[model samples]
Target chain A: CTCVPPHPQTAFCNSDLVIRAKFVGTPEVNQTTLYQRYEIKMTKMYKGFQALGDAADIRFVYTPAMESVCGYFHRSHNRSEEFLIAGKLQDGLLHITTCSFVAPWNSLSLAQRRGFTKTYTVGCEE
Target chain B: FRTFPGIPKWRKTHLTYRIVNYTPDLPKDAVDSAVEKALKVWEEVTPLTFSRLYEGEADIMISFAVREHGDFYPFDGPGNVLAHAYAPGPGINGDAHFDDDEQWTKDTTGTNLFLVAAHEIGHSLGLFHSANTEALMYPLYHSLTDLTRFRLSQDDINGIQSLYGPPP
Candidate 1:
């Protein structure tokens, strides 16, 4: 269970799409299997995204109710809070595990935030 | 160590492991000590004992790799997916892979090889990720600053003993 923290640059390069998006509603949970799915409304795209339109889906293995389980993330239901998600598209859906560089959009400083957007737009220059 | 559903464990308590290659980030003796200390974490808790191999195959094969080095899960640059190990059996099972892209270190500044090794060896011993956040088997990485003072949580102890029985 050892995970190296993904530097912002590495995450940006490896991810299929990096977006700042707000959770649309309460996460949907599969009662039997207990996977959580959150519908996200993309506010801005940072890299590797073509046409996601307005909304997309993100999946996690644990649900909010399963914090007692091997819970890596506790999904909070605040539609206004946006997140910077660096994830892969697996099985036709954006999949994020506890290992992904998922954090509050505001947690990053102005420069680091700009770096992600700038690198994607300007082609990884200084 | 706990298993994933029906995943197997080493058939015997005394096991042998070998470091196929060494990472340049640390001295050879340092890597050897780091691994020896990591294996002791379980040996201290279970009847299991471990021996180091200088050549040929071992019960567990330890190595470091970078992107697409081998197997399906390639190392992704420097960060994310620090390392992975398999459940007990033969071939790839009981093997541990470290992401050489990461800076392996002795302290909290870089990824502590001892702590990560301890966790991955828990997998090599057949333990899946534990629900207990405080357990070493928990899926998240917590920088353990002091290895000498380290102790496993009761949940982890219970899990390992359930598989191998209490230490003799």
Candidate 2:
């Protein structure tokens, strides 16, 4: 788990890709870290996206079960719930953690949503 | 209760750290200074003293990493999480990893490396996140421009002292 809680803008400016995505399939647990991987259908690209809408299938990895270690327990998935996913591609897979700027779309305020959708910053990605 | 379950505390007061990589967001001197200051935050309250290692393995291995650097804990892009550390133990114990995804700064404009390092160092010293908002062990990170005025709250002091006892 991350020791420090990040501000929204800090998440935005650092993400390789920021998008509004929805869970499309059942999560699969990998034995290595006991972390779960889910298939997300990208609906919109907020930043650092090179492809068009729905053209790419994002594989999102996160620890949904661990709590004491600061895992954000997001076990159940609802297709109707569009999540504001901020993530980076690692080993060719998109990975997220409980610490990312991840939440239900409606959970964010209008200004926060606007900040993600409208703002663009050069990320750490080469 | 201030420490992680099972109580993993450092066995020795003399510790060594190696900064394997430097963040591009700040100069090498700035990063070094921030790290020294962060370590001092704990050293002042405990008998622990940290020395920098130019090579080889150190007790506390510090590095800046992006997503899936090598560990099971892959850093998220940015924002929601800043950095992470391991509790005192063997192997990766007491190691600290900062997410290079965020712009580490010395001031309030972006994530303050010194403040984040101080918090992570607390974990390296066997302290967990404090529920008290005013405590340095608190999970949330905020901009603190006046580092000279920074001091550990009672919660932080009590937590560290519980593990290592009062500083000599």
Candidate 3:
């Protein structure tokens, strides 16, 4: 994915869901849908403006099946790390992509980590 | 100069490209010049050299597009995603698509087409974004005061070099 990513707040406000999820599995193509579906386990839901109910129930998120279109694939397929994921709710599916605000949870700033639960929510309300 | 898994790349150093189309924003000559210079960014560093194709398929196919141009990814509007490109492979793999929603300029007026094209071409050539902020392959917006003076960062050089090796 070749892109100029938006700011965390900018992306946070633009997105439909902001959550903490662990990488549970690698991407697999849904030939019928052409999506790079990652098996993820939701840990926290912050910016969805509501809840998705259960973490166990929300098992997967979809990106484009192909990379030219900004698909998300872990070349290493490391399922040990947790990520701060922000993506749009597209067509009843939570869509992640190369341009979305996706990063390993530990890599963020203190301000950004704090804002994810507070400032981002208030910023969205205004 | 990051790489994709399996290290997908062009098998040859002499590659060809064709401008699949142009943006309505710039003159034909300007776009052509930007592309030529962009490809040269990689050329100057690697053993690779690019030839422009006037007809038929080329290794790298570039074009300007807006929302959903027959691909799965759509340029959201103007700013978020200025463009998208695939890592080197066959078919759509090496194509670069610019988002026309951007006011793509010759220089640092609005969004510079030259910089974006250069960056996009990096991906088309199979390099991924770099953590080095100084690198052209960095995954954030860039605005150079003077682009003619621009050169790829060492990180950019090292990344591509890792894939295709050093210049002859």
Question: Model 2, residue B88: displacement in angstroms?
Answer: 1.2
Q: Per-candidate interface C-alpha RMSD?
A: 6.0, 4.7, 4.3
lDDT of 2 by residue, B1-168 (tens): 233222367778899999889999999999999999889888888888899998999988999999888766666556566787777777677788999989999877788888988888887778876668788877667566776788899998988899898877
State the TM-score of candidate 1 restricted to chain B.
0.93
TM-score of predicted chain B versus true chain B for each candidate:
0.93, 0.93, 0.93
lDDT by residue (tens digit), candidate 3, B65-152: 8887986667788677788887777777788898999888897798888888888888888887676888888756768898768978
lDDT of 3: 0.80
DockQ values of all predictions: 0.32, 0.22, 0.39
lDDT at position A60, candidate 3: 78
Model 3, TM vs. native: 0.80
Error at B70, model 3, angstroms = 1.6
Clashes of 3: 1
For candidate 1, lDDT tens digit of each residue in B1-168? 232222456788899999999999999899998999999989988999998998999978999989887764556667777887777877777888888988999876888898888988987887877768789887678787766688898998898888998888
Q: Provide the TM-score for each candidate, comma-separated.
A: 0.70, 0.64, 0.80
Error of 1 at A105 (Å): 10
Q: Chain A TM-score for each candidate, in the given order?
A: 0.70, 0.73, 0.87
lDDT of 1 at B151: 80
Better of 1 and 2 by TM-score: 1
Which predicted model would earn the best lDDT? 3
